[PDB]
């Protein structure tokens, strides 16, 4: 069992939407019962998909109403995480962790470009 | 399904042995087939127990010949990582990741005290 990422680096513009992908083998048919998909960055719960259900109550505050798993692509062996309205704080190293029979995870680096004004707000906040 | 750690902080001396422990629930007899235990620090593979056996081929070089999983305790719900001859590079944040039915992981901070001579090298 192997998780793979088509690209391990994403360069995204502040304010845009981004979809970062992780691949896992599904032969030709998904067994939702045996699937757990978990997305985290730093150590914040972004997505927890178990029993074919998104589990939203533990979703971390910074990602609520902004992150979802594109479920339709699961049939293809694709756990794609979409995050809307990217912030500078979305920059960092994401991990996609998948249990499907076996277990594996992969790392994805996200870098965020932002104009002066946004960076400026980020400079005073932190 | 919940992984728990009795201690999330360990302070260990350079040159000693350390055992960091994390628990997972085992209701009935342990089902080795359905168990995966994975220990990593930063992003170095320390140990991988799958198919009821340790897989050393992905093991990070800095932990070779120094890390072992305490296998007898698995039946009790304890995936304990033992590291022998602790080095300064062993300091950091460890994650113990367990798939047993569900899946979960926990973080453990390890700090290493060392004398001048060791720190110098
Ligand atoms: O219920 C709750 O609400 C509580 C719990 O009670 N949480 C819920 C919860 C549910 C799930 Cl489903 C979860 O998913 C873990 C998960 C999902 C899928 C595969 C694995 C896995 C496990 C073992 C081995 C493995 O493969 C090894 C990879 C080796 N590879 C890579 C390296 C090489 O290149 C090649 C080999 C993958 C794996 F663990 C994590 C969770 O916790 C959230 C959290 C964790 C730490 C924190 N710290 O701070 N806040 C934190 C918040």
Curated annotation (Swiss-Prot), chain B:
Stimuli inducing this protein: Up-regulated on T- and B-cells, dendritic cells, keratinocytes and monocytes after LPS and IFNG activation. Up-regulated in B-cells activated by surface Ig cross-linking.
Glycosylation sites: 17
Post-translational modification: Ubiquitinated; STUB1 likely mediates polyubiquitination of PD-L1/CD274 triggering its degradation. Ubiquitinated by MARCHF8; leading to degradation. Deubiquitinated by USP22; leading to stabilization.
Location of the Ig-like V-type domain: 1-109
Domain of life: Eukaryota
Subcellular localization(s) per the UniProt record: Cell membrane; Early endosome membrane; Recycling endosome membrane; Nucleus
Expression by tissue: Highly expressed in the heart, skeletal muscle, placenta and lung. Weakly expressed in the thymus, spleen, kidney and liver. Expressed on activated T- and B-cells, dendritic cells, keratinocytes and monocytes.
Coiled-coil regions, chain positions: none
Disulfide bonds: 22-96
Pathological condition linked to this protein in its record: Truncation of the 3'-untranslated (3'-UTR) region of CD274 transcripts leads to elevated expression of CD274 in multiple cancers including T-cell leukemia, diffuse large B-cell lymphoma and stomach adenocarcinoma. Disruption of 3'-UTR region is caused by structural variants that stabilize CD274 transcripts, leading to overexpression. Increased expression in tumors promotes immune evasion and tumor cell growth by allowing malignant cells to escape destruction by the immune system.
Function according to Swiss-Prot or TrEMBL: Plays a critical role in induction and maintenance of immune tolerance to self. As a ligand for the inhibitory receptor PDCD1/PD-1, modulates the activation threshold of T-cells and limits T-cell effector response. Through a yet unknown activating receptor, may costimulate T-cell subsets that predominantly produce interleukin-10 (IL10). Can also act as a transcription coactivator: in response to hypoxia, translocates into the nucleus via its interaction with phosphorylated STAT3 and promotes transcription of GSDMC, leading to pyroptosis. The PDCD1-mediated inhibitory pathway is exploited by tumors to attenuate anti-tumor immunity and escape destruction by the immune system, thereby facilitating tumor survival. The interaction with PDCD1/PD-1 inhibits cytotoxic T lymphocytes (CTLs) effector function. The blockage of the PDCD1-mediated pathway results in the reversal of the exhausted T-cell phenotype and the normalization of the anti-tumor response, providing a rationale for cancer immunotherapy.
Similarity field: Belongs to the immunoglobulin superfamily. BTN/MOG family.
Assembly and interaction partners: Interacts with PDCD1. Interacts (via transmembrane domain) with CMTM4 and CMTM6. Interacts with (phosphorylated) STAT3; promoting nuclear translocation. Interacts with CD80.
Protein name from the UniProt record: Programmed cell death 1 ligand 1
